[PDB]
Symmetry: D2
Subunit: 222 residues, 4 copies
Amino acid sequence: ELISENMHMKLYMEGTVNDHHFKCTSEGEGKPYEGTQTMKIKVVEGGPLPFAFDILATSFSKTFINHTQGIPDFFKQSFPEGFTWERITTYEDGGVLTATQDTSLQNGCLIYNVKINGVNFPSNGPVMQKKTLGWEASTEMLYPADSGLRGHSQMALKLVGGGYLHCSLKTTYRSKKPAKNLKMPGFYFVDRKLERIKEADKETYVEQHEMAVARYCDLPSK
Amino acid sequence: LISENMHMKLYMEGTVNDHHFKCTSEGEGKPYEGTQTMKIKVVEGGPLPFAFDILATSFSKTFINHTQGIPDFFKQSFPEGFTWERITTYEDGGVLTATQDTSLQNGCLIYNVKINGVNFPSNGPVMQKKTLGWEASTEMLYPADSGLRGHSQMALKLVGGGYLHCSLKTTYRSKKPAKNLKMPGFYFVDRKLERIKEADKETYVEQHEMAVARYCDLPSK
Amino acid sequence: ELISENMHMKLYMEGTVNDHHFKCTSEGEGKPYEGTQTMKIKVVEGGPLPFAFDILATSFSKTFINHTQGIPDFFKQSFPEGFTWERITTYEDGGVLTATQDTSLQNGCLIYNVKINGVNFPSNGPVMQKKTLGWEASTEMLYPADSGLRGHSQMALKLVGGGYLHCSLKTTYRSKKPAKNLKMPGFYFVDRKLERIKEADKETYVEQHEMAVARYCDLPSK
Amino acid sequence: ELISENMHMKLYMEGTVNDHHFKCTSEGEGKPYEGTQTMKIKVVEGGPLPFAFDILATSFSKTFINHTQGIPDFFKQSFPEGFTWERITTYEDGGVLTATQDTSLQNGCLIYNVKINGVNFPSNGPVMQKKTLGWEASTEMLYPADSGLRGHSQMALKLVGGGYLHCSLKTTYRSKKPAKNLKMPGFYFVDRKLERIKEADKETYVEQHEMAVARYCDLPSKL
């Protein structure tokens, strides 16, 4: 395939959260079939960001899911054409972050381009006041809808002092390959753990590692 | 206390949109293995004009297998018991809200449920009965609001192959004083709720649930 | 017709908010065609309530709307048979209150039967802390949907210390009269001011007054 | 003062709805104190759009609100520096449109820069099917929150064949003036009517007019 066992990525991100404009770039590498990857990210315009970098974590990679149990892999199948995703993340204290993303393969490097637009993050809440400590593990459910894949997830943001801020994600993933050339999956889950591995200079340099494994529910039917 | 085999007794009243109804049920399960079966009868208001699936999560938190040493909020709560309060919101505007009392009286678990559903659309899948039961789901739980907050989503199978989506937001509240309980931190519950029998236009239903509490499996760092 | 210019009502309410059960009853009088009405409310079981009584205010009367400009009156038309309503109110701090109601006409008296179910009101928010100070005015939009009338509104709840807690209402009103026997309205608006006029005994006795007037938007068109 | 009885505007817009990229520009003029205005709009990249232009209507001007009854005018007071706004629009059938906007005054011309990001518009919904017929009238409620103004509104989109698609708007309006150089409004309403006046070329050319008037509830209080 066009997708080898070891892969590199380059990403460009532009966005506004509330009234704050910024731009980021990243480089990473990963193991697409093993479902692991690492991104090294730079905030290159608008830094330091007045908000916790955590709210941008999920906008930095769907090729790198280990699909088990024979679940067809919508993302890997989509090459050489590529795919797009579009998401809304809604925080329980009224912040909203939308993202739309293009994924292309050029010269055997994955290229990501992301546009972020966040609005209504409370100015005295944990995100604008940087009281956050990263994400717990999460499970997304995916299934065919709207001519691609729909994904639904919920995630919990660790807060200083031991509490949690909740959010939900609703995504639609769309293949640039025609649908007659795809073996579509049915309903399944992706478990993931996205972890900050280091940061420097007021979150203007960040490293992230994710592991992502696709699976069915392993419980028996009666 | 709660044994390896327990029985349960349930009464439920509610209104969906404008339709009033009552159900009862009786069950038998294994709390530490986290399996259970409920045998349900619609006793007033049957046949319901909406799919019975929307009532499924309202018929049992004692019956979760809490593995990996996770403190068990529900089993710990007895003899005093606990409550839960939930909103289920469907993507097409239906909303089902539920509040529940769990007691224990002479070795029997006793469940009392009130239901209030609104805004279920007239020509949507629930009211037109085009649903085919729920896929498996995962709830995340963590302390909040003086008990445990649970967050789940679920996908209702539709005739023809599609899905209707719904989010659940629950608060579970122990009747046993905070000082007498060991709280868990963040964890998941995986479950599979299946209809195993029906009859008489969904006025008699049997459901089986399996539920297991765990942490994420994935290597860290 | 059966709706006179001066009318009485009696109400019975039952419900639970989080884990707290309660019952209320009330009696009222008002002027249906003028859109004004007063309800005198008693909390008869579960008093005193742990939550602000404000969250129950909108669950205590759609016959008393002044329908102006010839807008057909879905509610006064539905008698003698009556109507039902069902609503969800969603608070921006995670509280949710749903209510289902039956409105009948018996010996010249309007009879209301309300069931309340409120869930997830945060223990540190204004409702549970009893730090609220009543509602601002609001405007509902209504239009035919779902074989009845759909209503959408938003309300602002005044808070001790200043500022507001926002909620949104989504309702469906349903006539017990056949469609063929109703003149349906098109799209319109109802302006209201609901005000607490009296309270005693830790909110176990309350008096509310509402003025409601239906209209179209009066702005010139192009 | 810097805001006249007649003002002109220029706008630049960049965005993506679902996976479709586009840019728009427009110019208009209007009467800030009578709260009327007209915008003529060109799609200059990505046209003809595969979605209903109606979803972009509210992202093309808060200076043109007639603030009656003495209500302090957060927007007109903010000049020469200007203000920003950020909004989420949520459609009952799953589509979401967020927008962030900068409003500036340069050369006695009002300048708007907008970025749109919409996601998850259903393929068989009226918006993706271009089966919409413009907006009914609407009311916004506004009050101080978060060091700016919070706005909540709801709108009904007319549909081919009858009936409506609902959406809610939640906005935060932020002044570039510091708070101690502003007289802040309390709670109030804005009534508006945004109307499509002309269109050409499969909606690649559109004229909208809006009238907006600030007011309190004029029902009598019993308190």
